[PDB]
């Protein structure tokens, strides 16, 4: 499934992301845009054998298990497959844990390069009617 800008804004708000740990909704929508382009099915194989899964490209080396990664950690304690569904619940739950680290949303390279320091509020402006 691929979300529209406003549709995802609404789903993330409903999933308690708006202002979670100091990050307004526009940050999460922007992060999703540049990480997976709103695709819940997106997956990218990294150069070290690990793979990013889901709408927020969550890495299999430290957050989930796909059984295809060497000395892999599974901090979110889930099969990487659970991050690939039209229902973002698992993706959001793991993203909340991830952003609870001291690094915040810096964990996401795309967010650091395309969202941080910009008018992220623009991503949700003009939604809900």
């Amino acid at each position, epitope marked *: 499934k691929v979300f529209g800008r406003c549709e995802l804004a609404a789903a993330m708000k409903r*999933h308690g992301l708006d202002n979670y740990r100091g990050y307004s909704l526009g940050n999460w929508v922007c992060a999703a845009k540049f990480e997976s382009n709103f695709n819940t099915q997106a997956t990218n194989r990294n150069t070290d054998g690990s793979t990013d899964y889901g709408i927020l490209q969550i890495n299999s080396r430290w957050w989930c298990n796909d059984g295809r990664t060497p000395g892999s950690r599974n901090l979110c304690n889930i099969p990487c497959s659970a991050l690939l569904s039209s229902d973002i619940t698992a993706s959001v739950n793991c993203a909340k844990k991830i952003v609870s680290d001291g690094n915040g949303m810096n964990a996401w390279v795309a967010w650091r390069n395309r969202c941080k320091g910009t008018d992220v509020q623009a991503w949700i402006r003009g939604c809900r009617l």
Partner: antibody
Amino acid sequence: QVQLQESGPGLMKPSETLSLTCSVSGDSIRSDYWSWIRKPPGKGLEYIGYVSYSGSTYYNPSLKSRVTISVDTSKNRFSLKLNSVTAADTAVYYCARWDGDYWGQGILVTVSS
Amino acid sequence: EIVMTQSPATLSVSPGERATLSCRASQSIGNNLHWYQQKPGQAPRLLIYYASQSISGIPARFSGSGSGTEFTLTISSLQSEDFAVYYCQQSNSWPYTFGGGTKVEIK
């Protein structure tokens, strides 16, 4: 399947430092998140703080910067250090994985004063 | 910090009856509210996370709902093993905070 076990003192004088450790078996202290919670006598639950993957630590401000939390990857355990204790810090301390899924037996610490 | 208000302090109910615990937050916390159950002598146990997400191994009679600042934990058929103290906790902002707790006892 993860087992947590608190260890420390039961009684100690004020102005001293309270030190607790939580040994984790069946799982690796790896780069996971660990927390400390306590329940004061006749009060509810209070969150002490936690340490995450990067090593960054978050401490409840109400504890006036007296707390320190660290991870011992060699001996697979994490700790809690509370300076300048007083009667107010008397409680049952619990260690737990940040996700709230796993908890220790809990240990009673009394600062008789 | 965000203040969590649990109501009532002591809920008295008879076995088999339904029970509703309320938790309010002084700030909007999305769905970042979790419920804990603590029986005497034991450590707290997670029952419901993120306001309504159920946990495998937990009786079906436990369910939560709500969002923003209003949350509710409903217990269908109160049983003997359901008698204990219940706490709500928000993870929306640091420091994380717990409500004062709600002691569910037999009537």
